[PDB]
Amino acid sequence: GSSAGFDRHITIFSPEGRLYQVEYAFKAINQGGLTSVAVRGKDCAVIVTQKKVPDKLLDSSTVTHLFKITENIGCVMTGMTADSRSQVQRARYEAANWKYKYGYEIPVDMLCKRIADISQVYTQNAEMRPLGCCMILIGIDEEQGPQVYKCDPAGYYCGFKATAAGVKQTESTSFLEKKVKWTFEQTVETAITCLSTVLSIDFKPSEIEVGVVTVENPKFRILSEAEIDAHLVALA
Amino acid sequence: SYDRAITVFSPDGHLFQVEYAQEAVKKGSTAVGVRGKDIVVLGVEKKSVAKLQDERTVRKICALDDNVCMAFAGLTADARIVINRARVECQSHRLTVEDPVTVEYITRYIASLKQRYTQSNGRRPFGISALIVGFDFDGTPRLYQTDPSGTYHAWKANAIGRGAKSVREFLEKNYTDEAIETDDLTIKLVIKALLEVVQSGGKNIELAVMRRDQPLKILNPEEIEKYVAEI
Amino acid sequence: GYSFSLTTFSPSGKLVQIEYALAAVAGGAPSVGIKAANGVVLATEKKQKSILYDERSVHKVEPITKHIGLVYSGMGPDYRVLVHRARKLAQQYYLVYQEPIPTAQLVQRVASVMQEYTQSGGVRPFGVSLLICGWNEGRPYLFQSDPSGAYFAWKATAMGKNYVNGKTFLEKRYNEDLELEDAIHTAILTLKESFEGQMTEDNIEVGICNEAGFRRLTPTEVKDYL
Amino acid sequence: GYDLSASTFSPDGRVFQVEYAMKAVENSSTAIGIRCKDGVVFGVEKLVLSKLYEEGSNKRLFNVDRHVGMAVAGLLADARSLADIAREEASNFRSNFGYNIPLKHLADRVAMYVHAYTLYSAVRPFGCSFMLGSYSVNDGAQLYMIDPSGVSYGYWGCAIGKARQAAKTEIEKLQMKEMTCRDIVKEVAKIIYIVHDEVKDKAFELELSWVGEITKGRHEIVPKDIREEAEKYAKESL
Amino acid sequence: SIMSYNGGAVMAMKGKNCVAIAADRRFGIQAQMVTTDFQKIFPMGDRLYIGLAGLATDVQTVAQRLKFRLNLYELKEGRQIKPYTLMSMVANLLYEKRFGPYYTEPVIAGLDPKTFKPFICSLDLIGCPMVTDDFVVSGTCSEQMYGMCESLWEPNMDPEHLFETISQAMLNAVDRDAVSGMGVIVHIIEKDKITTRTLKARMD
């Protein structure tokens, strides 16, 4: 836990070889108080996220953490809201550019890597802080099937079978660890169950958000309140 | 691009960095100049008199052109930069005015460059002081002195570097017309002045005299020894 | 951006930021490099935090060209930057000379980039050490490039966690007449000395470099060696 | 000191400079926006700090486009700059795509511009909050609010400024969804009179603007005579 | 044309374990001859030479910039450049001036530094390579050179026979060219030695 000079203020190495500012950025993801879970099925990918809107005067439809990057790529953001929006805007641009210059749709892992590389620059340059958010990407790849990727503030990215982010990230990881060691309905139910179990909450249709991509219908889709209700009743 | 203001005003109205540059000049080797009838005398403490050294490679006295020489004190690396900037200026002046520069003209250019480095973003002031001599187009002897701040003055006799005060204090009482009457008499005033601070005065002192329409004629070990012998 | 340096000289003559970058490299996952008579082996420990991670989604051993492979110890995201820059440097060289860049030439260029980050404005040095291998003119090469930009040629070496013991182990096991297959065995054994629990074919990555070129060993192949 | 720069995260993951900019908004006077069925009504409690000032001085209601109105709170100079940024964004969109910029897209662009001043030490976060109201046949009524951090959301009713909490409670009692702009104007006036403090901040002027079916999609200042009824009704209410 | 302003001719021939490079020595401006000892063939290694024909000013500039690049290469790489690598280096240098080209067509001749295999090639002013197994020509009298080379060149010639062949090829070719001539210089590159000969030629 040693420190020296300005190592807790800017992204420079501390005596132990750590980057405190990057570590503080991970704590900024938990400031929002939400948890997200992504599960990969045999032929589908599902993203579920907590939807808290206790303001009441807010327009519920505009409050969301699920975004469409391209026609076949969806994503869920966790952490600082404004930081997330800019990261989503950047990802949309990166994908559009890739298609334009290479003539084909950007692979999910290439997009995640591209976002991770942009995040890395903030951890090496002192004049700007890292974004306080986390991005999880899902989509169907022609040969590898359903993909689930996640990149953080450090610029680290990885592919997962199942993953999570936010306040209850650690417990979601443990819960899914046992389960992993699946049909569309099973993958969706697994995701909702993980979120419900770690949060100790019997979810209602308008309290969660669901995004999916399947081998049959690759287009990223958001489930409606009625579609989510069907799954919620089957789990009960 | 580094644009931080390095030289700024202090509460008492002083420029800290400029005063620190003057401190560096004080640690430099002693240099002494003296005006003469038709020759100028420049004496610099050689100090480093190692037996494994190639003496010619580290000369403090330099030529700026065919008619102007100069001595410096302080950071030797800073001095080399300024000397070369002045050389380019002299060449430029000969290609746009069709005439050699006067002593004051090159002193002005050098002083102006030093002043520019005390009011520019991203850079520290030059850590040197210079003594400029020579003769003008007609044939009059000049002795100027510039410092880190960019101010320059003409002098009859002057000293710079370590223990400059001591050599300056002693120079007032020993500078006259009889003393600078003959060419060999201009070499006598300098040496004595240098001897008040130069350890083991003799082979630790470099010499140079600028005459009329004559090149940088550095004196030699035995040449200087003659004067040292008699003295 | 800041135009001043972040790495400066301390009173005792050290550049602490580079020393702190070396501490980040020392706390990283172990990496071993062994130069055999007819090839080079690059082995690294790649232990995931859980079984949720997809082992075949990211790699630590990366090809730069057809004859050059890379491995690192330290910060993963910093390593990605250098890999991309190394690939670019190799292609620039190929465009001009129409021949694959010699390993030593590539290491020099990569080290130069790393040196730049210890003196340039507003940036910290890379927190990674590299192990570069290659085959040029019927001969194998093994180089190490650290955070400061200095690089050394090695016969066999180790970096990251417990590298000091790994180097001592290598000194009492490495010989000049060793063969690639034999080199691969002693490379895995070196990783085993500092390994935690149960070395499988999913928690270690192996890359080899011979006359045919540089290639990452497939999991099936790694299983056979284990 | 972890709160001197916007490019510095504090140990518990916070950007204190952005939070300090939000304090400035909380010191300002209240401004409310209500979205009904026919359009959007804006109401601002413009404090008159001196009798020497003319009526209409230092307005907090702007026109950023033909169909878009903007209500602000916080540092007026910062807010005026943001209004110019929004105007330019709307004008740029019309040039590139040939039609009126959708409100949601306009709110996104401005919010990201606002978000750009929260990442570096070279600049400081904007010290204001604002609402964007609009109405078109295709999109209907829209109301967005953006704060100093750059987050923007759509609302049915919103309030910004010092009495944002007290104003919000008043706004929740109304059923704006099925209401029309004409009857909502009086309600907005009423709420501002209720949240206005008398002991402190004596003397204020009510600013009203609206956009909807009644103004044919054009954002404008509520007609004087219609504002007279509202002011009258609000005075009697409290 | 700009390529005939100064005249000149260069040719390279491949033999059995050896290479030959020759050129005329005339330096002239249009019809007027200025000197008769102008250098057109520059050494670029122990067994690697480059011949340049075309505008005299560009001949000197290209040779000097190439020397600059080759020297830096040898210091950095710590080895002698390969004949083929030099060809690429030269092509890259000429292509950089795609729109505002150096008016010269280089000819490379040499033996590889480790295997001593003969190598010859010719590039155009833009930088397109032409690696051949027999000969390469460049200059104002290329048509005459092609004629001489096509009928005289034989495979697997030894150093003596190769010398005679390239000598006769150049002599008879430059004699039918008005702005080329005033002497011929020939370099025979062998694995163990370099032989340089000046031929007895017409001076008109």
Add this chain to the structure above:
Amino acid sequence: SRRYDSRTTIFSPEGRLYQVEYAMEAIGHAGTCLGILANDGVLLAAERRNIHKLLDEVFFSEKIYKLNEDMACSVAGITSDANVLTNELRLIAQRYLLQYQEPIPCEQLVTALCDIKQAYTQFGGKRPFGVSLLYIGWDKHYGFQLYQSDPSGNYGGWKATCIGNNSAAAVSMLKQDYKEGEMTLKSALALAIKVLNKTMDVSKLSAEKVEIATLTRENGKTVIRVLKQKEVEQLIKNHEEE
């Protein structure tokens, strides 16, 4: 921005440049580099730091770099900083040759590099290069020469000199053993070994712990070569008998 600026190029209260002095401290602990000028050539002897048994040898040397056809140099201090300066030296020499079609005079090359070093200590806000160099070369104006330059941008010509670890003690020995104008390459090589034996603290001198390069004129051409282990081993043997 101002809060983090380390201010590398400013004068200290007593007119000193801290970064330059701190860089000199680093050079003082680095490997020993010694240069000796003789009547028929110059030599460079440098102690090797990379001595690990698992290290491989595939370069020209470790601390000795050829700059052009008639010049070589040795470095002391930050290794990666030396690579930057050595590459710059090569470019300066080639640029001079492109312009005048003649090899750059030894002193002119050193002066050009010193100008770059001086610039870092005056403006830019960057830390200086932590390198000290020794140059050996031959030119048509002054024949065989030896130069030494440091981080401040200062340089000087020498008959014999030393930089790096225990250079102050190495310089003392040189003063009492170097014969002005009566030295030869063979006699200079012996002195180098003698001096190197004292400054180094590892009993047996060892051929693997050192690197020696000589610069001579052969048939109107400069020859620079790094002595092989055999030649170096023999030299060490001579000292034992000496």
Add this chain to the structure above:
Amino acid sequence: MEYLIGIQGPDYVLVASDQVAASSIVQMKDDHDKMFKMSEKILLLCVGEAGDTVQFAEYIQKNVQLYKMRNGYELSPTAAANFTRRNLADCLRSRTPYHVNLLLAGYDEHEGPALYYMDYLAALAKAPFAAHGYGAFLTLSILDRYYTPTISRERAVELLRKCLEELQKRFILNLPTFSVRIIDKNGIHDLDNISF
């Protein structure tokens, strides 16, 4: 058109040039010097487009002088010739090229006497003798016929006179006087003008 000529002997270089400065059909100056002293042993003879010659020559002169000030010794004739060519060739494809023809004569301590010929396109050539201008067409063959490598300076002056006499009789332009200079180990010497 202006006339330049250089003859290199075993240990000296002899140069000469016309002194006419013209404006269309009138000789505005009849004693114009076309030689520029770059250093103690180097002369630069320049002719060509009005304005360019002086601008270019002065630029070279200032750089040659600066080299001596910075190093303590003069640039050799060969290095100076190459420096001149480099500069001339750099402006060849630029917006402001220098349309000048020149001869560089000099004496090097180690190398001896040197004569360099340079056209406007910057091609550099060392030669025993050379000439520039329309007059070179009538005098080059004369030098070819009488010049020997061991020609003495007295015979060289007579050889130069032969060339200049040919111009008086054959050339259409009026060139009545020539500047004559010689460069050797003792520096640059001014000989008597050759007038007609």
Add this chain to the structure above:
Amino acid sequence: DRGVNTFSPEGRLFQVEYAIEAIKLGSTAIGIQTSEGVCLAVEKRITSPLMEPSSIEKIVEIDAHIGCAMSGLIADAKTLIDKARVETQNHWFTYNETMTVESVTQAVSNLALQFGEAMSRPFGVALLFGGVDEKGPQLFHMDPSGTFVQCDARAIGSASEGAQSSLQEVYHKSMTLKEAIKSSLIILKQVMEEKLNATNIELATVQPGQNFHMFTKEELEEVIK
């Protein structure tokens, strides 16, 4: 540590206030404007006996009708002096006429606050501009803050407070140039540490019809008696 453009709690720019402090360490300069012209007198303040008094230039010519006296950091003054000379010559070239004293002072003043992090700090000098135009003799004074004003009589430098008192007690609207020249020398002598001779002070005048004239040694001695 603050930046160069930092405001103090009392509403002042620190650097500008520190630059004004520097003016107080400078030599005393006196300016007096009368109906017959303007005179400028400055104490040379020679530090040593080996120093040549003629090399010290505290009073300079900007143009034929305008003179200038400086005080404070003399090296900084040169930059402004050259700027002023260029301004008047540019004005002559463009409008075929002379620039007024006020205009020249305005142009020079516009370069005072142009610094930040291009000047890195304000100029540490005060200027006195004296000359004759269509409005007759005119005296202007400019300091480091960029503020310039017309004055009847003004003193700047180390002993400016003492000099000002004397000036305002002995100055009237009818006084001739001779009285001004004598009065200004009387005050200079009273605030000068050293003895006031003809080699340790500088004097110049500018009258209607006459050009900027720097008094010679002989002319000073005559007046000094």
Add this chain to the structure above:
Amino acid sequence: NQYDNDVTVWSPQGRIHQIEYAMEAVKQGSATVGLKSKTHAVLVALKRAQSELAAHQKKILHVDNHIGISIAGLTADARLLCNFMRQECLDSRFVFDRPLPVSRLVSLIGSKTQIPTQRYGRRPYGVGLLIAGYDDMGPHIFQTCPSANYFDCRAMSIGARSQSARTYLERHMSGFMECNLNELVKHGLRALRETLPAEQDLTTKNVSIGIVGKDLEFTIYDDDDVSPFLEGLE
């Protein structure tokens, strides 16, 4: 303490100390009063005198035929802003062949002076202004500050001890519209007189006037020309 050196640093109470410090510069400058009627706009400034022998520092400046200004604070900043205003007015006449409406010019000053309050290493303009002008909407009186905020006023006062001048204006503002030019200027001089200490009075050496109106170009009255306006004032 740690929050009062840079303009980009927000303090914990939600304020920017550097901008507050820049407002102090305006408060220490000599007072200036600006008022208007239904037909005219008047500017009255108390010219301060550094010395007893120096001239009174100018305060009122011509910007255009329909616009005049008064400054309080840093003179350097005032000149910079005045130059900018003059250029904007010139541009308007060059492009549209008409005078730039006063309100639009004040908006331009606001955005220009706001930029430096958000950028690191920049400082706020340390000057306050009173802008008098006349256009199609009538006569105007605007007030700008160092924090880039501006106000449209019926009457205003800025500078040292201007609070008492504002107090005076507050009670007499009711009869400003109907007031004719001569009496409108009196109200201006009376308010300006309040800021002066008891002993000192308004003379022809320390009072400059600026007037613009329905049928009058902005004109500055100094010295002897202000006599008429002063003579007859109780």
